[PDB]
Amino acid sequence: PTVVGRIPVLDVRPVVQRGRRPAKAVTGESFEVSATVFREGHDAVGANVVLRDPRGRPGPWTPMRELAPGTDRWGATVTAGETGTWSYTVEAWGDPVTTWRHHARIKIPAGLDTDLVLEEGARLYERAAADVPGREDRRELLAAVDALRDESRPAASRLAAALTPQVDAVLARHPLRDLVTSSDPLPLLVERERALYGAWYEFFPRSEGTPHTPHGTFRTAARRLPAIAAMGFDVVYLPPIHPIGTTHRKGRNNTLSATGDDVGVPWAIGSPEGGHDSIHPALGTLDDFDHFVTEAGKLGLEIALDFALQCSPDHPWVHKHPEWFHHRPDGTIAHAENPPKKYQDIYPIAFDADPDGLATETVRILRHWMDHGVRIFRVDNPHTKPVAFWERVIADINGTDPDVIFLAAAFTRPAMMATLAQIGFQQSYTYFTWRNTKQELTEYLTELSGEAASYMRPNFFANTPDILHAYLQHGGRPAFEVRAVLAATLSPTWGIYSGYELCENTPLREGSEEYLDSEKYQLKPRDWTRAAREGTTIAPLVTRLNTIRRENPALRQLRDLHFHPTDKEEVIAYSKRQGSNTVLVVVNLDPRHTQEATVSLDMPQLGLDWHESVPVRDELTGETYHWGRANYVRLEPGRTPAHVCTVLR
Amino acid sequence: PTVVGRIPVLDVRPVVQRGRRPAKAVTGESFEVSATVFREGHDAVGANVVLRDPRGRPGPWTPMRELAPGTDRWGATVTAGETGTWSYTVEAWGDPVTTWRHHARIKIPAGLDTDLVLEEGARLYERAAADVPGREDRRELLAAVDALRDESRPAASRLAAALTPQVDAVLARHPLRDLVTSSDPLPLLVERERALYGAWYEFFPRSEGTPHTPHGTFRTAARRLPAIAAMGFDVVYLPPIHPIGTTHRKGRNNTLSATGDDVGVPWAIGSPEGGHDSIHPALGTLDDFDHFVTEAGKLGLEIALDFALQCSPDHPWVHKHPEWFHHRPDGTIAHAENPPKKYQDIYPIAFDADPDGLATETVRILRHWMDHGVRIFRVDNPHTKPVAFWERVIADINGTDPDVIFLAAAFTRPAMMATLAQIGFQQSYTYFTWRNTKQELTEYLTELSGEAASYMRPNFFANTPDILHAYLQHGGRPAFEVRAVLAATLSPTWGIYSGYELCENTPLREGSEEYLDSEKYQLKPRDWTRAAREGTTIAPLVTRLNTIRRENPALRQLRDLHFHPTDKEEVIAYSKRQGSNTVLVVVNLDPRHTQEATVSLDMPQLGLDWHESVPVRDELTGETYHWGRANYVRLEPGRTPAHVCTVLR
Ligand SMILES: OC[C@H]1O[C@H](O[C@H]2[C@H](O)[C@@H](O)[C@@H](O[C@H]3[C@H](O)[C@@H](O)[C@@H](O[C@H]4[C@H](O)[C@@H](O)[C@@H](O[C@H]5[C@H](O)[C@@H](O)[C@@H](O[C@H]6[C@H](O)[C@@H](O)[C@@H](O[C@H]7[C@H](O)[C@@H](O)[C@@H](O[C@H]8[C@H](O)[C@@H](O)[C@@H](O)O[C@@H]8CO)O[C@@H]7CO)O[C@@H]6CO)O[C@@H]5CO)O[C@@H]4CO)O[C@@H]3CO)O[C@@H]2CO)[C@H](O)[C@@H](O)[C@@H]1O
Ligand SMILES: OC[C@H]1O[C@H](O[C@H]2[C@H](O)[C@@H](O)[C@@H](O[C@H]3[C@H](O)[C@@H](O)[C@@H](O[C@H]4[C@H](O)[C@@H](O)[C@@H](O[C@H]5[C@H](O)[C@@H](O)[C@@H](O[C@H]6[C@H](O)[C@@H](O)[C@@H](O[C@H]7[C@H](O)[C@@H](O)[C@@H](O[C@H]8[C@H](O)[C@@H](O)[C@@H](O)O[C@@H]8CO)O[C@@H]7CO)O[C@@H]6CO)O[C@@H]5CO)O[C@@H]4CO)O[C@@H]3CO)O[C@@H]2CO)[C@H](O)[C@@H](O)[C@@H]1O
Ligand SMILES: OC[C@H]1O[C@H](O[C@H]2[C@H](O)[C@@H](O)[C@@H](O[C@H]3[C@H](O)[C@@H](O)[C@@H](O[C@H]4[C@H](O)[C@@H](O)[C@@H](O[C@H]5[C@H](O)[C@@H](O)[C@@H](O)O[C@@H]5CO)O[C@@H]4CO)O[C@@H]3CO)O[C@@H]2CO)[C@H](O)[C@@H](O)[C@@H]1O
Ligand SMILES: OC[C@H]1O[C@H](O[C@H]2[C@H](O)[C@@H](O)[C@@H](O[C@H]3[C@H](O)[C@@H](O)[C@@H](O[C@H]4[C@H](O)[C@@H](O)[C@@H](O[C@H]5[C@H](O)[C@@H](O)[C@@H](O)O[C@@H]5CO)O[C@@H]4CO)O[C@@H]3CO)O[C@@H]2CO)[C@H](O)[C@@H](O)[C@@H]1O
């Protein structure tokens, strides 16, 4: 054998860990398959992509084209259908017909060996007619052959009866392919839509209580579901819903000692009342939780539970499974860390005494919540448990229930982030919150929509309970408006944590990214009705952004994204496309000062002529503009954070 | 079974075609094995490279280090030994001792759990002690244990007894590795020194004739070998030495019809007198060729024959193997093309009718010349024959005779260039002659000495019989000096085509890269004795450059190469190192004007202090300067084309 085939087809992308892990897509998503294709000598090559479904059935005729001249890099867009494990192949081939046309264009006019050239022609077109399975098509070609060999017609007459648009059509569909050479198949995992596209809202059920009973239940917190659905959200992420430990319970504002009333941190999971398969008694029963899930579902909301593989000192596991913890010479267990942060209320799990026991128990727990309608898990600190443990766990869960989605909350270095996504995590948190300037956003979104999109699906939370960026702190409401526009338009999945709507931005101290009086360590009742009444919420903008995403397919995908130059540091501009839907966004990143700029659009990228003018509608205002290659914009913080425009087609 | 191991070790490099083709090296050559290595949580990792020889014998302990902070990318240098197929593997592991130290360096001056910390170290050093081979080493580790355990001593002195330089050495040589995890082995092909390092000289034997017999023989051409070996060359590249066709034979200066005594083009191989297994009858007999080869060897020169797989119309193959050519509808064979260069004197070979017979015959022809001591083949136009043909042919020949070296004369696009080298070509012609400015040289050499060094070895011909670059046309002798120093010092393999010495630079016409009165179409007698008598030759400089190369191991390798800044655009600087040998080179690229500039060196990159001084010797002159951080140079065309300095230590 030989590594290289007759016509070289090499370095097929996408590829993840050299073929050992699947590339990713979701139902309905288009992406580029590419390859290096070329041949010996000067004759033309062609190439096509053969995408195959889980039962092995090939997709449609999908020809490729060289992506830039002289590079020998070929590409074509493919689209994924039903969920499951697909494969894709690039077929490369000599294209004698393009070759002969190239020569027949020059030699026939300038006079050289004409009878010979046309007869070389007729034999190609005759070989073309055999592989063609339709009879009306086949006759269209045998007409060109007889016209090529008809020596009573002059030279340019016999030539041009082979170069009609009528014949182009047949050969564009069934071309003559020499020396078909095939790459080895690469794997593609196609998952459900929600893996890539959705809006997420995080809240603490315990905060939504009553005057007589401050600690909310599932029954009381259900009253927020209608409002969350009215904002356009699809997923509700709940922090841990299990009993909370008492030993070393943290107090308000992350203090070491709890008072009597203090509720502790949901992440300090476990007490005598139960562990990860239990409900905090103050939240209600498993029955109340089913009713919450049922109400959520009737409003089009899925529930995502936090899975945090750690324990308070009171978790049953501490006595039932001591071997799942590292003990020091004196018997004690070191509390968890993530420096310079210390988690004095919890123990980390050790995996090397009993990995099998731990995988078995973990998938048992997940299967429990899956039985009760939870098909999404937000996995806490996955980067502090082994990578292979998650690879096993996710493989096991998806083996039986491929619809389950796991989101890696991996705020960590790039290698681990990438690796977690590559071993099966459906979505990932990202560096979004720490990308605020134009350069930062452009660089990073260029990275996420590029190569990374074959293994990572980003979830852009503009805030979290642990992340209030200095941009939001210093810039106030105009800043919240900017980051929501940015989050919802740059990623097909975005989210907020309750209170973002109210522009809560008081930090614990200057230089921190923690909230003052954080909800992690206390009940936090909010006057939602008063904020609506007095207009001190951005819930309308949030609602509007989700409607725009729901109405424009371009915003429900990731990979088609392009940045257009403006002439101000503070004004950034980008576009996204999907079929006939084009969305064009311009954002002022200055939350204190009005900016005016000229956005110089890159018209070929919008599928347009440079000299063209096209109507757009700002979906944030309903106002219509006429824009082309060079457009004045004026953006005033408070009043207009951005223009979010559809191209009227 | 998980793809990912316990301690992730990922994306091991070098790698060629995803592990389906070997990376390359030569005996004595050092290169970097790298990998992405990290683990879950905050604890430290270590890693090492296990290079295995062709019998499986592992190499020495070879620990890696993180190459830049926060990247998780680790590397170490390895050195290839005897020839054959080797393998390499990266081992990654938990480094508990480093982890304990970082925790203890903090927790002991604090006072936080000191008896408990020091017992944890004692127990680690106990484990470390068990795995050590040496008696003296195990005693040193068990001493540090008792010092850690001695509760009557203060905390800082118990710890200090485990942090000594004496213990550090033991553990760096024999460390305690948790959870050892291995990459899958990658293949390395190790070839003879000559594949990477050597000086090449091309000449046409027929031009070394007599007054009474103008057409040179192998007997007369042997008398040119001593001057070639005195110039310090290692290889003699001869154009095709076979009989030459008469049908469509070309005349002088590439005209279509030859006169009665025109000698034709050597590459138009074949007459009734023989094919690629025969000697041109004007060159002598097979026996004369053996005498020639022997005379070459006696002077330390190896012979490289041109292998051009093509035919004159009079080549026996035309009638014997008709299926080895492409025939038009009238039975005529179209002459070869490489547009706009027409080759009217030859036919190209077609490969898809009888590939087995073509391969069989090609290896037979190659084996014939190998029986007569030809161990190197300069393969003409490899990019016009199928890639898989050369893969097959090279695999065949190297399977019995691994010392045979194939050099790819592929002046073509990047993707084919690279692919040829990756499928087995030991050496590759390059874009060197079209890289004349500082920006061009730096960019290209950065490319050739980085990632492509794992599959391609460059041969820098400053000229060929097809390439007289304008730099040399417009530059005169000073330009010949510049390009010779550049070629000899930037690649461990370089060469020249005869006449380069004499500063032959008249082109066929303005804007061509062909020689006037090109030696391809005529006898080109050269009065070597006269040019030496008169000094109209750079043979002294050539001798000197090769001698410098023979005495500085830095110039006999490719991959260690760094460029240092200068403030003139016309002056380029670079260093190369190998063990304790370091060669600094500064070249004036201006052939017409005298140039002065400040060379600002990158002193860390030479293994030196920023505030350091170092004695250098320009080996071109014998002069000695004292250079440091910033250095004045004055380079005068004619007198001083460059400085080629060594570092005296
Ligand atoms: O009851 C228990 C418990 O409950 C709660 O706690 C829980 C939380 O509620 C829960 O959500 C969860 O949160 C924790 C989370 O899981 C942890 O991972 C942890 O994350 C935080 C980090 O600890 C913290 O440091 C920070 O980190 C982020 C940085 O601040 C950002 O700036 C950002 O940094 C990344 C860069 O953006 C990115 O570019 C890349 O950087 C690389 C560079 O590009 C590259 O050049 C190179 O840099 C070099 C330089 O070039 C060189 O010159 C020189 O300076 O070195 C550098 C590098 O050393 O390399 C760079 C890579 O290193 O990557 C950067 C990533 O490092 O992102 C950082 C990470 O996202 O914020 C994190 C998020 O908050 O802590 C979370 C909070 O606890 O789990 C908790 C436990 O269950 C309560 O809160 C508790 O009180 C309670 O006890
Ligand atoms: O008896 C028979 C016969 O005998 C003799 O002939 C024989 C000879 O004696 C023998 O030695 C042998 O020689 C021939 C050789 O084998 C042939 O291949 C042929 O080679 C010559 C070429 O025909 C000729 O064109 C030329 O080519 C070189 C260029 O001049 C250089 O400029 C250089 O170009 C390369 C670039 O340097 C490099 O960067 C790369 O460029 C790519 C870019 O990097 C990339 O960005 C992209 O560019 C885009 C741009 O982005 C875009 O904006 C826009 O501009 O488009 C471009 C792309 O179009 O892509 C670029 C390309 O992919 O590659 C460039 C080249 O591809 O290098 C060129 C090649 O090295 O010189 C060649 C060397 O001579 O001809 C030789 C001579 O015949 O075999 C002969 C046959 O046996 C006698 O001589 C005969 O008379 C006799 O009949
Ligand atoms: O298209 C979306 C846009 O629609 C509406 O804009 C209209 C404007 O309200 C209206 O005034 C008009 O725009 C005129 C503008 O009135 C006029 O003054 C002139 O603008 C000048 C600035 O006055 C001048 O300071 C300077 O400003 C920038 C410059 O743009 C920038 O390129 C760089 O050089 O810095 C300068 C200083 O910061 O130059 C500009 C012109 O380049 O010309 C404008 C041309 O139209 O008409 C607009 C509709 O066509 C909405 O009001 C607005 O909110 C929406 O964004
Ligand atoms: O190191 C290799 C070098 O060694 C020997 O050079 C020595 C000289 O022979 C010796 O005279 C001395 O050099 C003096 C120089 O004579 C003196 O004129 C001065 O040079 C000035 C220039 O006059 C001035 O035009 C300017 O030149 C450059 C500048 O360097 C550059 O950075 C940029 O700004 O462009 C300018 C315009 O061309 O500045 C320089 C000084 O920076 O000072 C020199 C100080 O050394 O010492 C030399 C070192 O030993 C050999 O003789 C010589 O052949 C070798 O090349």
Author numbering:
A (entry chain A), B (entry chain B): 15 to 663
From the paper:
It is the third and defining enzyme of the four-step GlgE pathway that is responsible for the biosynthesis of a branched α-glucan. The key contribution that GlgE makes is to preferentially extend A chains, limiting the opportunity for GlgB to introduce a second branch into B and C chains.
Fortuitously, this yielded a structure where malto-octaose was bound such that it occupied both the donor and cyclodextrin binding sites, whereas the donor analogue was unexpectedly absent from the crystal. This structure would therefore appear to represent a product-bound species with subsites −2 to +6 occupied. The two sugar residues in the donor site are oriented in a manner similar to those observed with maltose and α-maltose 1-phosphate. The residues occupying subsites +3 to +6 overlap with those seen in cyclodextrins and the maltopentaose described above but are somewhat displaced to allow the product to bind in the appropriate orientation. The conformation of the oligosaccharide was unusually flat and extended compared with amylose or amylopectin, which have α-1,4 torsion angles closer to that of maltose (ϕ = 116° and ψ = −118°). This was particularly striking at the linkage where the donor and acceptor glucose residues occupying subsites −1 and +1 connect (ϕ = 34° and ψ = −157°), giving the longest distance between the 2- and 3′-hydroxyl oxygens of 4.9 Å.
